[PDB]
From TrEMBL:
Organism whose genome encodes this protein: Vibrio harveyi (Beneckea harveyi)
Entry keyword set: Glycosidase, Hydrolase
Name of this chain's protein: beta-N-acetylhexosaminidase
Domain Glycoside hydrolase family 20 catalytic: residue ranges: 260-607
Domain Beta-hexosaminidase bacterial type N-terminal: 138-248
Ligand binding (N-acetyl-D-glucosamine): R271, D529, W543, E581
GO molecular-function terms, A-Z: beta-N-acetylglucosaminidase activity
């Protein structure tokens, strides 16, 4: 509280915002050779800074004042501008701030209090959730066919679990595990049990049958995944009485199968590191809503989270950022050394944990862009001293793109991919393949040489060169390559590369028609980092737009496509993603993920005909006490 910085919006016009920064020395003694540092997500226009010199590396901004001295009880004021529509949220302000100064002959540092930004144009409107009845069967996702009867089945801890297929072993263990964890309710193996797992080979992958009778529960499935799905439904269907030590399930016949094969969630671990325990906790939660894929975003500009034993610098340098680290801090934790990584022993532990819930893990290694952390960890391999090329990434980096003319770039990727491929049993690896900043490599001697050797005229074609290498390496390693939206354009990758389409549904279907299998993860409606309401106090970002629960539920993928259309074979399925630029703890993560995850699950699992916003809300209301028992800090829809 000695130091405070106030940010105020001064003017908002077409694609321009001007700000007033006022720094207050509230200490009793002067500041000499002082400098201000803060975290800001927007590109500050350098020609707009009015009283100082501002440097910006990603989110990390340092403002050097004009004068060497600011007196005690005095204020320093500086203006800047950005290219932006009006700020709507307080999170659009500075996340954190600090100062550096010299007391006598020694350098010092102090945290600065960041006042919430004074917004000019917050939203007046608010998303409204209607009052809702509690549905008796609070099932998310809603099964594609369920029929109910008046009678119900009551059973105690000695009902016994009978299993007549080795296919149901995994799912059975998980059911018993969760019943213990959540409800403290212990079930045991019994050849003569009332709860029965039975094989039915006529049922397709993921499909199951759940019949509850007055004195038994019978589960039927053709696959291990089907049995898990049935167990997820069962966990939601059960009601426990506290006065007794019993469980109840309404009599019903459930016949159910997944609408899409791929049903995914992606967690950004590069921007902020989340613990193994947090990842495990989330993975288990994903299985409750019958998702089958966890996409682990392990690498980006702001962190490298996966141990590569042959290149230990990637974790030793690249898993940490800070003032005293090589990599500058980003977003939060400006004052300390921030970071973390997953060891390969831990990663194997998470893989096996995921496997027990039917979750496949897909790893992502980002090239050629989004590679700042790698580059700073391996300057000897990855930097070209001679290259003077001036570029800027969409995330305000000028030094974060891999060089396809350096042999060390190929050494690095080959070693990383070898160790990732060996470590991750899923036959897939995601490579990023985001479009590089325009102009990149254009003044690189090594690239200019490679361009003449290759016979290319445009430096953008070097992305394909590097990416075709990565695809072939992965092929020899037994893996199919996955990439983001922009990989499809130019000739960069084969038609074997699975494209994760974020742009739009029509662009995705356009990609399918070119021969690529595609995953649907549109930014307009699947990005859980988006704010959940128009209130300025809501945490999140809104660059795509706000994503209130209703907009999330309205997402009906392939609604206009006919059922007999052959393009449906190109559609692997759907993913929802949590980017973590401003999400650095479990509590916030839960708040942003839930409840919208349940709407995303229903989009991947349930057919549009059984989808209904009113019905969904009743089922969600009935589901909330189960999330309460688990201590999930979801955003309360009824306030």
């Amino acid at each position: 509280s000695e130091y405070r910085v106030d940010l105020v919006v001064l003017s908002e016009q077409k694609q321009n915002c001007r700000f007033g920064l006022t720094f207050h020395n509230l200490s009793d003694q002067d500041l000499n050779s002082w400098g201000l540092t803060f975290a800001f997500d927007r590109y500050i226009l350098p020609d707009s800074v009015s009283n100082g010199q501002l440097t910006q590396i990603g989110s990390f901004c340092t403002l050097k004042p004009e004068g060497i001295v600011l007196a005690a009880n005095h204020h320093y004021y500086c203006e800047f501008s950005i290219g932006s529509n009006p700020f709507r949220y307080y999170s659009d302000g500075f996340n954190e701030a600090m100062i550096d100064f010299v007391v006598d002959g020694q350098p010092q540092r102090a945290q600065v209090d960041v006042t919430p930004i004074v917004l000019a144009s917050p939203y007046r409107e608010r998303s409204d959730i209607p009052a809702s009845l509690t549905h008796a069967q609070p099932l998310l996702p809603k099964p594609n066919h369920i029929e109910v009867s008046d009678h119900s089945f009551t059973f105690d801890e000695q009902a016994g679990v009978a299993i007549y297929t080795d296919l149901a072993n995994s799912a059975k263990a998980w059911l018993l595990e969760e019943l213990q964890r959540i409800h403290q309710f212990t079930l045991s193996s019994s050849n003569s049990g009332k709860i029965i797992f039975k094989s039915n080979p006529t049922l397709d992958e993921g499909a199951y049958k759940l019949k509850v009778s007055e004195e038994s529960i019978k589960i039927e499935a053709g696959s291990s995944s089907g049995f898990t799905h049935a167990c997820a439904t069962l966990l939601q269907l059960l009601k426990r009485d506290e006065a007794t030590k019993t469980m109840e399930a309404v009599c019903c016949s459930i016949i159910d199968s997944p609408r899409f094969r791929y049903r995914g969630m992606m967690l950004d671990c590069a921007r902020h590191f989340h613990s193994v325990e947090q990842v495990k906790r989330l993975i288990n939660l994903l299985a409750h809503y019958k998702l089958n894929t966890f996409h682990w975003h392990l690498t980006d500009d702001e962190g490298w989270r996966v141990e590569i034993k042959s290149l230990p610098q990637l974790t030793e340098i690249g898993a940490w950022r800070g003032i005293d680290e090589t990599i500058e801090p980003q977003y939060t934790h400006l004052s300390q050394r921030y970071g973390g990584f997953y060891t390969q022993e831990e990663i194997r532990d998470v893989i096996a944990f995921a496997e027990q819930r039917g979750i496949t893990i897909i790893p992502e290694i980002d090239v050629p862009g989004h590679c700042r952390a790698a580059i700073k960890s391996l300057p000897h391999l990855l930097i070209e001293a001679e290259d003077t090329t001036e570029y800027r990434s969409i995330q305000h980096y000028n030094d974060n793109v891999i060089n396809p003319a350096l042999p060390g770039s190929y050494e690095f990727i080959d070693k990383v991919l070898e160790e990732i491929a060996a470590l991750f049993p899923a036959p897939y690896v995601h490579i990023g393949a985001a479009e590089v900043p325009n102009g990149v490599w254009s003044k690189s001697p090594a690239c200019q040489a490679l361009m003449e050797q290759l016979g290319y005229t445009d430096y953008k074609e070097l992305q394909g060169h590097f990416l075709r290498h990565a695809e072939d390496k992965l092929r020899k390693l037994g893996k199919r390559m996955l990439g983001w939206e922009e990989a499809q354009h130019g000739n960069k990758v084969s038609k074997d590369t699975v494209i994760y389409s974020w742009l739009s549904e029509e662009a995705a279907l356009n990609c399918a028609r070119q021969g690529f299998d595609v995953v649907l993860q549109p930014a307009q409606t699947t990005y859980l980092d988006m704010t959940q309401d128009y209130a300025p106090e809501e945490p999140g970002v809104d660059w795509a737009n706000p994503l209130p629960l209703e907009k999330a539920y309205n997402y009906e993928p392939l609604a206009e496509v006919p059922a007999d259309d052959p393009i449906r074979k190109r559609i692997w399925g759907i993913q929802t993603a949590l980017w973590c630029e401003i999400i650095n703890n479990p509590s916030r993560m839960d708040y942003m993920i839930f409840p919208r995850l349940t709407a995303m699950a229903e989009a991947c699992w349930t057919e549009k005909q059984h989808r209904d916003w009113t019905d969904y809300l009743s089922r969600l209301k009935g589901h909330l006490p189960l999330l309460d028992l688990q201590g999930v800090n979801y955003r309360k829809p009824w306030k």
